[PDB]
Write an enzyme that holds these catalytic residues in place. Structure first.
Site, mmCIF file in Angstrom:
data_model
loop_
_atom_site.group_PDB
_atom_site.id
_atom_site.type_symbol
_atom_site.label_atom_id
_atom_site.label_comp_id
_atom_site.label_asym_id
_atom_site.label_seq_id
_atom_site.Cartn_x
_atom_site.Cartn_y
_atom_site.Cartn_z
ATOM 1 N N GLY C 145 0.792 -1.220 0.000
ATOM 2 C CA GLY C 145 0.000 0.000 0.000
ATOM 3 C C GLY C 145 0.827 1.274 0.000
ATOM 4 O O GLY C 145 0.331 2.331 -0.399
ATOM 5 N N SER C 174 -2.578 -10.107 -0.753
ATOM 6 C CA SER C 174 -3.394 -8.893 -0.822
ATOM 7 C C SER C 174 -3.399 -8.365 -2.254
ATOM 8 O O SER C 174 -2.680 -8.877 -3.103
ATOM 9 C CB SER C 174 -2.859 -7.831 0.138
ATOM 10 N N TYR C 271 -19.917 31.445 -10.699
ATOM 11 C CA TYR C 271 -20.453 32.246 -9.602
ATOM 12 C C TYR C 271 -19.758 33.604 -9.497
ATOM 13 O O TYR C 271 -20.325 34.557 -8.971
ATOM 14 C CB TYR C 271 -20.330 31.504 -8.267
HETATM 15 C C1 LIG Z 1 -38.119 26.241 -3.769
HETATM 16 C C2 LIG Z 1 -39.157 27.180 -4.472
HETATM 17 C C3 LIG Z 1 -39.518 26.596 -5.871
HETATM 18 C C4 LIG Z 1 -40.435 27.268 -3.609
HETATM 19 O O1 LIG Z 1 -41.185 28.352 -4.128
HETATM 20 P P1 LIG Z 1 -42.457 28.816 -3.262
HETATM 21 O O2 LIG Z 1 -43.213 27.592 -2.792
HETATM 22 O O3 LIG Z 1 -43.371 29.664 -4.133
HETATM 23 O O4 LIG Z 1 -42.002 29.671 -1.992
HETATM 24 P P2 LIG Z 1 -41.062 30.966 -2.026
HETATM 25 O O5 LIG Z 1 -40.409 31.087 -3.379
HETATM 26 O O6 LIG Z 1 -41.880 32.198 -1.745
HETATM 27 O O7 LIG Z 1 -39.966 30.791 -0.920
HETATM 28 C C5 LIG Z 1 -40.418 30.715 0.412
HETATM 29 C C6 LIG Z 1 -39.384 31.462 1.287
HETATM 30 O O8 LIG Z 1 -38.291 30.782 1.307
HETATM 31 C C7 LIG Z 1 -37.241 31.454 0.609
HETATM 32 N N1 LIG Z 1 -36.388 30.563 -0.131
HETATM 33 C C8 LIG Z 1 -36.734 29.485 -0.852
HETATM 34 N N2 LIG Z 1 -35.661 28.899 -1.396
HETATM 35 C C9 LIG Z 1 -34.605 29.627 -0.994
HETATM 36 C C10 LIG Z 1 -33.281 29.451 -1.272
HETATM 37 N N3 LIG Z 1 -32.468 28.535 -2.015
HETATM 38 N N4 LIG Z 1 -32.393 30.305 -0.755
HETATM 39 C C11 LIG Z 1 -32.845 31.329 0.028
HETATM 40 N N5 LIG Z 1 -34.156 31.520 0.313
HETATM 41 C C12 LIG Z 1 -35.044 30.642 -0.202
HETATM 42 C C13 LIG Z 1 -37.866 32.319 -0.163
HETATM 43 O O9 LIG Z 1 -36.949 33.477 -0.514
HETATM 44 C C14 LIG Z 1 -39.046 32.806 0.663
HETATM 45 O O10 LIG Z 1 -38.589 33.670 1.622
HETATM 46 P P3 LIG Z 1 -39.503 34.807 2.228
HETATM 47 O O11 LIG Z 1 -40.214 35.526 1.114
HETATM 48 O O12 LIG Z 1 -40.519 34.192 3.158
HETATM 49 O O13 LIG Z 1 -38.650 35.785 2.991
HETATM 50 C C15 LIG Z 1 -38.543 28.587 -4.645
HETATM 51 O O14 LIG Z 1 -38.384 29.151 -3.393
HETATM 52 C C16 LIG Z 1 -37.205 28.636 -5.364
HETATM 53 O O15 LIG Z 1 -37.110 28.751 -6.567
HETATM 54 N N6 LIG Z 1 -36.053 28.556 -4.487
HETATM 55 C C17 LIG Z 1 -34.747 28.625 -5.096
HETATM 56 C C18 LIG Z 1 -34.260 27.311 -5.677
HETATM 57 C C19 LIG Z 1 -32.845 27.713 -6.106
HETATM 58 O O16 LIG Z 1 -32.681 28.416 -7.084
HETATM 59 N N7 LIG Z 1 -31.709 27.275 -5.337
HETATM 60 C C20 LIG Z 1 -30.380 27.671 -5.755
HETATM 61 C C21 LIG Z 1 -30.204 27.324 -7.226
HETATM 62 S S1 LIG Z 1 -28.511 26.838 -7.523
HETATM 63 C C22 LIG Z 1 -28.304 25.597 -6.265
HETATM 64 O O17 LIG Z 1 -29.245 25.221 -5.610
HETATM 65 C C23 LIG Z 1 -26.925 25.009 -6.030
HETATM 66 C C24 LIG Z 1 -26.431 24.898 -4.740
HETATM 67 C C25 LIG Z 1 -25.174 24.362 -4.524
HETATM 68 C C26 LIG Z 1 -24.407 23.935 -5.599
HETATM 69 C C27 LIG Z 1 -24.900 24.046 -6.891
HETATM 70 C C28 LIG Z 1 -26.159 24.583 -7.107
HETATM 71 O O18 LIG Z 1 -26.660 24.696 -8.411
HETATM 72 C C1 LIG Z 2 9.484 -3.291 2.820
HETATM 73 C C2 LIG Z 2 10.389 -4.569 2.845
HETATM 74 C C3 LIG Z 2 10.615 -5.093 1.394
HETATM 75 C C4 LIG Z 2 11.743 -4.246 3.508
HETATM 76 O O1 LIG Z 2 12.486 -5.443 3.617
HETATM 77 P P1 LIG Z 2 13.744 -5.331 4.613
HETATM 78 O O2 LIG Z 2 14.640 -4.196 4.167
HETATM 79 O O3 LIG Z 2 14.527 -6.635 4.585
HETATM 80 O O4 LIG Z 2 13.232 -5.051 6.102
HETATM 81 P P2 LIG Z 2 12.426 -6.084 7.026
HETATM 82 O O5 LIG Z 2 11.654 -7.042 6.156
HETATM 83 O O6 LIG Z 2 13.393 -6.853 7.884
HETATM 84 O O7 LIG Z 2 11.430 -5.285 7.941
HETATM 85 C C5 LIG Z 2 11.973 -4.551 9.018
HETATM 86 C C6 LIG Z 2 11.012 -4.663 10.232
HETATM 87 O O8 LIG Z 2 9.906 -4.090 9.957
HETATM 88 C C7 LIG Z 2 8.868 -5.055 9.865
HETATM 89 N N1 LIG Z 2 7.930 -4.693 8.835
HETATM 90 C C8 LIG Z 2 8.260 -4.218 7.615
HETATM 91 N N2 LIG Z 2 7.141 -3.995 6.906
HETATM 92 C C9 LIG Z 2 6.095 -4.336 7.690
HETATM 93 C C10 LIG Z 2 4.765 -4.294 7.414
HETATM 94 N N3 LIG Z 2 3.928 -3.906 6.317
HETATM 95 N N4 LIG Z 2 3.889 -4.678 8.342
HETATM 96 C C11 LIG Z 2 4.357 -5.117 9.544
HETATM 97 N N5 LIG Z 2 5.684 -5.175 9.844
HETATM 98 C C12 LIG Z 2 6.568 -4.771 8.902
HETATM 99 C C13 LIG Z 2 9.464 -6.197 9.667
HETATM 100 O O9 LIG Z 2 8.576 -7.343 10.118
HETATM 101 C C14 LIG Z 2 10.706 -6.122 10.529
HETATM 102 O O10 LIG Z 2 10.379 -6.290 11.854
HETATM 103 P P3 LIG Z 2 11.363 -6.949 12.910
HETATM 104 O O11 LIG Z 2 11.975 -8.189 12.319
HETATM 105 O O12 LIG Z 2 12.452 -5.970 13.261
HETATM 106 O O13 LIG Z 2 10.591 -7.312 14.155
HETATM 107 C C15 LIG Z 2 9.729 -5.672 3.712
HETATM 108 O O14 LIG Z 2 9.706 -5.249 5.028
HETATM 109 C C16 LIG Z 2 8.305 -6.033 3.289
HETATM 110 O O15 LIG Z 2 8.078 -6.744 2.335
HETATM 111 N N6 LIG Z 2 7.247 -5.502 4.118
HETATM 112 C C17 LIG Z 2 5.901 -5.871 3.755
HETATM 113 C C18 LIG Z 2 5.371 -5.309 2.426
HETATM 114 C C19 LIG Z 2 3.878 -5.683 2.501
HETATM 115 O O16 LIG Z 2 3.589 -6.853 2.348
HETATM 116 N N7 LIG Z 2 2.942 -4.674 2.896
HETATM 117 C C20 LIG Z 2 1.568 -5.092 3.009
HETATM 118 C C21 LIG Z 2 1.132 -5.688 1.682
HETATM 119 S S1 LIG Z 2 -0.646 -5.598 1.620
HETATM 120 C C22 LIG Z 2 -0.890 -3.858 1.901
HETATM 121 O O17 LIG Z 2 0.022 -3.087 2.067
HETATM 122 C C23 LIG Z 2 -2.313 -3.332 1.890
HETATM 123 C C24 LIG Z 2 -2.887 -2.867 3.063
HETATM 124 C C25 LIG Z 2 -4.185 -2.386 3.054
HETATM 125 C C26 LIG Z 2 -4.912 -2.369 1.871
HETATM 126 C C27 LIG Z 2 -4.339 -2.835 0.697
HETATM 127 C C28 LIG Z 2 -3.039 -3.316 0.706
HETATM 128 O O18 LIG Z 2 -2.457 -3.787 -0.479
#
Ligand SMILES: CC(C)(COP(=O)(O)OP(=O)(O)OC[C@H]1O[C@@H](n2cnc3c(N)ncnc32)[C@H](O)[C@@H]1OP(=O)(O)O)[C@@H](O)C(=O)NCCC(=O)NCCSC(=O)c1ccccc1O
Ligand SMILES: CC(C)(COP(=O)(O)OP(=O)(O)OC[C@H]1O[C@@H](n2cnc3c(N)ncnc32)[C@H](O)[C@@H]1OP(=O)(O)O)[C@@H](O)C(=O)NCCC(=O)NCCSC(=O)c1ccccc1O
Ligand SMILES: CC(C)(COP(=O)(O)OP(=O)(O)OC[C@H]1O[C@@H](n2cnc3c(N)ncnc32)[C@H](O)[C@@H]1OP(=O)(O)O)[C@@H](O)C(=O)NCCC(=O)NCCSC(=O)c1ccccc1O
Ligand SMILES: CC(C)(COP(=O)(O)OP(=O)(O)OC[C@H]1O[C@@H](n2cnc3c(N)ncnc32)[C@H](O)[C@@H]1OP(=O)(O)O)[C@@H](O)C(=O)NCCC(=O)NCCSC(=O)c1ccccc1O
Lengths: 301, 299, 298, 301, 300, 298
Positions: C145, C174, C271
């Protein structure tokens, strides 16, 4: 007085500079920060050819770079002048599909294909544009959504669907095609793996309600009101902090999109950092050839 | 002459007469292009117009069927002090609180106040990453900040033995690339080295970066583009289809669903080539059931 | 020959009870020293060690005047002069339920009422998630890994003469199946990481540096001096940028948790903005927010 | 006789050591291995301030480390004494929100903010605590769940909701905030990407039944019975193998949580290995400075 | 009205499998569809290691059968003891030991071969189902419990008997857990909240309840369960087999990491091998000459 | 100078029918040797070879007295004396549908009723998923699919004199877009992996060792001796820990499949516990389980 058409001409104005569009229409709302982008080949259920994809990309890119636009409504025009049938989009135009993919042609049919020019699959570029744009795209499914048209619905942020006319059908494997990207894998992130596999492996037709129940359609609307409801959703989106909306979209994308998702989210975080006095001090110290002084700035946790 | 650039080897490209911050050449014989920063007076720092030009040029190369390999580099040396640079990142002179800003001139005085800043070198990073062609960075000098991050996102990197200098200065000026510049660097040099590069911002040589894994090869300065051309030739001598698939294979998982979209897109194209896919098309167009019987189930 | 310079370090408020760990703050620098303090068993940790280590690291996390943590081991062994960073879990108190709390150093004093734990994992996460750079100074044996703790730190400096890396997990039945193994592969690549665990050989500082797990090798006597220099270079940069960068490096490897941490800092940055303040103010003033002053960026 | 309040005072006892809680309440059941953790600021709809978060973390951490507790019930107290309104949690308290995050204040309002102290967002730390704890956390949504309050519901393992009074509303973007982690991304892992995006982008109010249908609420209960049902669910959880339940929670977390998820799950696997004779022989051989003898332990496949 | 989903007239035994005891294996008389079923209804179709071996053998044979596009996986019944219906009740607890499920000469723990270590290799069958380039439809005709529930989950599609399907994740009741496809992948069908509920409480759910949560594709009348299975199989078999193959691996890909990439990229390699360009690479090697790639355009 | 020591290896019962592969068990050790036996074509594999290789590796997987697999190639070529590990798929029987079964060695004896296969991928997964360490011994050319087999093994040892690594895939219009390429990047990094595939240069054992894809270089004559030494070090550790570690290294790169394998081993560990046995016993005895003796760890 019930309109068979969701389009309200009084609500929309053509965008300047796009008079040459043929396969796509592009409008800006007269009042809102919303645009309307639509397939305009209803005679083939709004199937796209490579020119269509080029126009679509061009239009969506323009919308992306329009600071006064918050939301895109993506839909299909209609109905078919041939049979009155309604479609969002039926995917790639099979008439100009070749062994190298969908090919540019001078006309509508295979005999007009430019044989010297390699095919493309670049509706994928439009998918990425929709995915990466820092604006909400809402698909309005006004009719058939099939094949790549279905996959376009899937990659949009939200989908609204016509009760009467929406029909979802993944026909890819029927014609030996497959969308192995957002159309399939990302559908599973909406309806779960069992339903997503069912949709592709069996290729059944589903209603708006069925797709809503499965998790791929946010809401069902009446056909005549589909764009009206789309505009309402857009207005609710546009009434919030545009900064927060941008960050949220990229947060939803992030992990699914790996490093690309990280790049986009982190890019926005970098911009937030550039706004801070701390970042300004970093710039200033470099320009002034002096050590930066970070002492005014706390280490938040 | 200690300049890597051999003028006789390179040709200009239709439609790019208006380039100011970038140069773009196609090789006289090879399926290789040369794309280069052209602001050596400021260590090839990019401003938003530079990014626009770079995107346009790389996008053109992407859509050029006769081009297999992109060499990305910087022109030099500085006419002021003879210093060599690949790219020193964003031009700090026109960095604002909203990012890097368009200006009519070179300094903050001329920034267009009505126009929000941009960080869209990230779009160029993605274009390099997603293009179905090998991009080789030739680090001919300083690669710092966003310049360093561009080197990182390239498929390959060759570096000048004498003059390449890698220094990730982001945190020095309160900036960070939290995408390809950092996370993807870790996919080249590992997490310990990538963290060191960013957290301490030390200066590394070509040889040091080669040892860490971010530089493919070290070349003599004068030979850097010659070696680049040789590498490109070896790449261009293989199956273009295989090379395409391989690049998207390398990208795939790191890039999540986007990576899958790109690779699967190429697999769809391979499938469209098959008789089986053609039968799917034909049956739809002929309004008849498809006949799949000639096509065996492989395992 | 000892890396520890007593004159450079001071004790910290509230930690007078530490037994298994030492904790110092540098006299001048924004740097702390956190060290295992069981050199007689090669700095093996027991559950109490883990608790102490967590507490100390959490404190450093929440300290605004601290930028860098130096994590090391004290030594040498008073018994045989051997040097260790950390030899992993202490086998003396390892049981069937994990490592067990004991009042003493051996199994003899294990608390029978308390189940074993493996919560060095909590420390690993604390190191991973904290918005500060943690540098491991490996001054001797790093085993099991202990080796895994080195792996999860942001940076590692190692004693040329005495650092010895040896993943002995499987020798004793693995395994660290988390950061210790999979994240080691993100440093040295899959081939070398598998070799390190499957064979459990002993490696030097230089060998581990060549493989990519050790950032730099230092003379034993200079190990902490070099650590302080690295810390100073880290502390000379934007704290904000450094924070964001650590979480960017973590992000994708850490999935949703990585996203949570990185996004959390992004939220904080938001925006700070006038836009976010208006959101707040509008809610408080029961009025609609006005977002018109704030442009849509692309 | 119908109670307006889910809380049954006779069933709960205060937990020892938590007398100082102001913003959160914390109870242990009189009979069961179950605790009750609740927001306690109903006058502001159970909004959290940094102190609230600190208390919440402390309480949840204590529950985590309580071996005789198997289940956490996380809820909100109410109703508002001002207007009778019910809330689970309304997120961060906006009154004390500043530029550096939510700030510590001596009072409830902005004028009492410690200005010397940086703000925090560390409800995230509570989210991780809930996520990583080897016990089931059940959110009982008894009213409004808004903003960060909504995100807290999301990260819990299970959610039960009041039929009459639960209201789910993600108001983040309304006030310029965002939860870009578990609140958003992980919500998508419950309701799918389309619905998650809808919940955040539009910030509409949803009922218990609506959230149940989308997949974020496990069951709806009568308000008066909400905690009784929570206790019944807790009893079913506590009747199974605690070891299996632990492993299952970390299995569900694992891949979504990347290396962290792996760390937690592998950590429990290490615990299982340590229980074996084979692991004990490894330990013994080391301690006894001899080679290990693995011959008694078969290889499994 | 038949109490049995099985239509004997529609199925023929597959040649070479007359030694099967715990599993049945049929090929449809007309369709490119096979029926693979648990055959221990007396113990609610619990599997023992021999069952798993037979199941693997049969599924592997179906995988390698070019004229088969879909596998219907189900359970036979009812129990002759009490008329009870089961798809699969998981591992046979009678022969569960400390090392896993053990081979036994008989039905009970006393007949266990103590010299032979236990196995959990239903996981191998889970992978075989996951990786095979064919759609596997689970037909849940009764109890789907424990490991039987997890088999349902890993199948590409699930159809369930209205009257008799019962879903119950009993793992934690007996101290077991499927910490792979059974749990995590269930969350990719019903979401994290419902998946956690299913495992943590171990309640019994109906076909309709599981359909509403997203783990069951459709509910069918018990008597029609296999008829509907065959109809779903026919719809699958009417599409491009190449496209179906690629789609299955696209759905697996990212959830399955590098393994997912390996399978999808493998199929991409096969597609590349079909091209003239790949054939030129081979020919140039065999003919000891440089390849000529000029006929093959770069695509973008 | 042949790496193979005939006195050290014995044939395995049941495999006298092998033609393209050899299979031996060490006379003393818990180690087997699996080798390509077509050195006349640089040990290229055909579908029958793949079938034999799968069969042999599967048998080794299910052999409780075997802990380590050595995968190599026999040689040298009787024709020109050249050494090979494996040159990938046998191009002589490669068709548009993949590598084809033939009754002889060339395309003229291909069975056309039988679609081609690419099922070396199945062997790749078998190597990847088996709860035992597989060490590749690269004794010569490793090219194309042979190179990719080396990549997917847990460890690689390579002949100093004769190992040659050359990823020729793109040269013949092929590609390994899975473990061969993406996983190589997890060993040598993205820049080097891209170089190896995009340029297809020839590399030595030492060059590949420096990049991270070869664990160690050995003298040709000693390659299997060194392989046996590595196997012995592996076999001297906890077999349980080694199993868990392999699946931990695989896990996240392999997504849900990785999780399935690792969690499966965790389930087995749980089955060993008194707690799990109570769960079984209560079910069999039709009574409520009593979980009271078993603590809730944290
Ligand atoms: C949702 C909708 C169609 C509902 O309309 P309606 O049922 O007639 O109610 P109204 O439009 O009067 O809204 C009720 C109150 O909630 C506010 N309100 C509703 N939606 C709001 C909003 N997003 N933000 C702030 N105030 C909101 C309104 O301003 C109003 O407030 P007050 O008059 O009571 O003070 C109608 O309200 C509508 O068209 N809302 C807007 C939908 C919209 O355009 N959202 C953003 C577009 S881009 C986006 O959503 C976006 C966001 C993140 C990433 C990417 C993106 O593209
Ligand atoms: C990296 C390598 C080739 C180095 O070899 P070398 O230079 O001879 O060192 P050595 O093998 O003696 O390792 C030194 C110490 O570190 C430990 N050690 C080294 N690597 C370890 C490891 N991954 N885990 C636990 N203990 C480790 C060893 O057991 C040893 O410990 P002690 O004898 O001093 O007590 C050689 O060490 C080697 O081949 N290591 C293993 C490579 C490996 O198999 N990694 C995991 C494969 S699967 C994986 O990584 C994985 C994990 C999650 C998701 C997906 C994945 O693919
Ligand atoms: C690159 C480096 C290390 C070169 O050192 P040196 O050899 O000493 O050159 P010197 O520092 O003298 O610079 C030469 C001239 O070019 C200017 N210059 C160099 N780099 C510049 C730059 N980026 N912007 C504006 N002017 C520059 C300098 O100001 C100087 O001009 P004059 O003294 O003649 O007036 C050393 O010069 C250096 O550290 N440059 C800064 C590299 C840097 O930090 N870039 C931004 C970091 S973050 C970033 O690039 C970024 C960009 C976009 C998005 C995210 C991002 O993180
Ligand atoms: C399946 C279920 C819920 C049905 O209950 P019920 O309808 O009331 O019938 P009953 O419980 O009486 O069972 C009918 C007969 O079949 C036996 N039986 C049923 N399932 C058995 C089983 N797995 N093993 C041995 N005998 C079984 C029973 O012992 C009983 O036998 P007799 O009294 O007539 O002699 C009810 O039977 C039930 O709860 N079964 C338990 C399913 C279970 O949880 N198994 C192990 C859990 S872990 C797992 O499934 C698993 C399996 C493979 C790999 C990994 C895994 O985690």
């Amino acid at each position: 007085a019930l309109s068979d058409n969701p389009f309200d001409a009084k609500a929309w104005r053509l965008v300047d500079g796009f008079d040459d569009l043929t396969d796509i229409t592009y409008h800006r709302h007269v009042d809102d920060a919303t645009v309307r982008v639509a397939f305009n080949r209803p005679e083939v259920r709004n199937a796209f050819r490579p020119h269509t994809v080029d126009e679509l990309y061009r239009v969506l890119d323009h919308a992306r770079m329009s600071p006064d636009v918050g939301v895109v409504l993506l839909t299909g025009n209609g109905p078919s002048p041939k049979d009155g049938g309604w479609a969002f989009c039926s995917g790639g135009d099979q008439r100009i599909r070749g062994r190298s993919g969908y090919q540019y042609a001078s006309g509508d049919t295979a005999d007009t294909v430019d044989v010297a020019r390699a095919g493309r699959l670049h509706i994928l570029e439009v998918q990425r544009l929709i995915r990466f744009m820092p604006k909400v795209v809402i698909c309005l499914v006004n009719g058939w959504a099939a094949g790549g048209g279905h996959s376009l619905h899937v990659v949009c942020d939200l989908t609204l669907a016509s009760r009467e006319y929406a029909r979802f059908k993944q026909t890819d494997a029927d014609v030996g095609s497959f969308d192995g990207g957002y159309g399939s894998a990302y559908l599973a992130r909406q309806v779960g793996q069992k339903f997503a596999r069912e949709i592709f492996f069996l290729g059944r037709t589903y209603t708006a309600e069925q797709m809503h129940q499965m998790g791929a359609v946010n809401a069902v609307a009446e056909h005549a009101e589909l764009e009206t409801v789309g505009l309402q959703w857009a207005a609710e989106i546009n009434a919030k902090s545009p900064q927060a909306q941008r960050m949220l979209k990229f947060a939803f994308n992030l992990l699914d999109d790996g490093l690309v998702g990280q790049q986009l989210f982190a890019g926005e975080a970098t911009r937030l950092a550039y706004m801070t006095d701390e970042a300004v001090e970093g710039r200033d110290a470099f320009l002034q050839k002096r050590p930066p002084d970070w002492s005014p700035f706390p280490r938040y946790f």
